[PDB]
């Protein structure tokens, strides 16, 4: 085959395929982060990787380092625990998953739009790359100098 289709640049990410991990309680789920762009900045045109909300919290933060970068808020709220023992107070409903599933998608959908982010590597690493490598080695990093 050959194929060949294009027209107008478009950078968007999809969040679906909610898979549950672990067993017992305070369990969590993931989402298939499938991005699709036609920009050069991105080495790959399309890639599918697995990621969760808690993960995004690592990425987002990575953006909230220092670079006049405007990162959007994460969909969720929780802060009332002295010691790391408790988590979710029994929550199992499509709505919830949807909320986050959609939320993130939106957050990234906008985050991706960000130019300062489009250059960021962590972003890509959080996309193309399936497994993040905390304290990775920077190289190439899109069109450097300029």
UniProtKB/Swiss-Prot annotation:
Any one of the GO CC terms: early endosome
Chief place of localization: membrane
Domain of life: Eukaryota
Membrane association type: Peripheral membrane protein
Key word Glycoprotein present: no
Disulphide bond pairs: none
Residues bound to a 1,2-diacyl-sn-glycero-3-phospho-(1D-myo-inositol-3-phosphate): 52, 54, 77, 100
One biological process term in Gene Ontology: late endosome to Golgi transport
GO molecular function, one term: phosphatidylinositol binding
Residues where Phosphoserine is found: 54
The PX domain, residue ranges: 9-133
Record's keyword terms, sorted: Acetylation, Lipid-binding, Membrane, Phosphoprotein, Protein transport, Transport
Localization, UniProt: Membrane
Its biological purpose: May be involved in several stages of intracellular trafficking.
Protein family membership: Belongs to the sorting nexin family.
Comment text on domains: The PX domain mediates interaction with membranes enriched in phosphatidylinositol 3-phosphate.
UniProt-recorded name of the protein: Sorting nexin-12
Native source organism of the sequence: Homo sapiens
Lineage: Eukaryota, Metazoa, Chordata, Craniata, Vertebrata
Gene, per the UniProt record: SNX12
């Amino acid at each position: 085959g050959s194929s060949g289709s294009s027209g107008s640049n478009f950078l968007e990410i999809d969040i679906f395929n909610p898979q549950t991990v672990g067993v017992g309680r305070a369990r969590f789920t993931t989402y298939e982060v499938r991005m699709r762009t036609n920009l050069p900045i991105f080495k790959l045109k399309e890639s599918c990787v697995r990621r969760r909300y808690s993960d995004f919290e690592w990425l987002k933060n990575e953006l909230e380092r220092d670079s006049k970068i405007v990162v959007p808020p994460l969909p969720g709220k929780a802060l009332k625990r002295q010691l790391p023992f408790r988590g979710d107070e029994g929550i199992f409903e499509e709505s919830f998953i949807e909320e986050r599933r959609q939320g993130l998608e939106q957050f990234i959908n906008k985050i991706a739009g960000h130019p300062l982010a489009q250059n960021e590597r962590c972003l890509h690493m959080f996309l193309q790359e399936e497994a993040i490598d905390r304290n990775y080695v920077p190289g190439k990093s899109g069109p450097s100098s300029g």
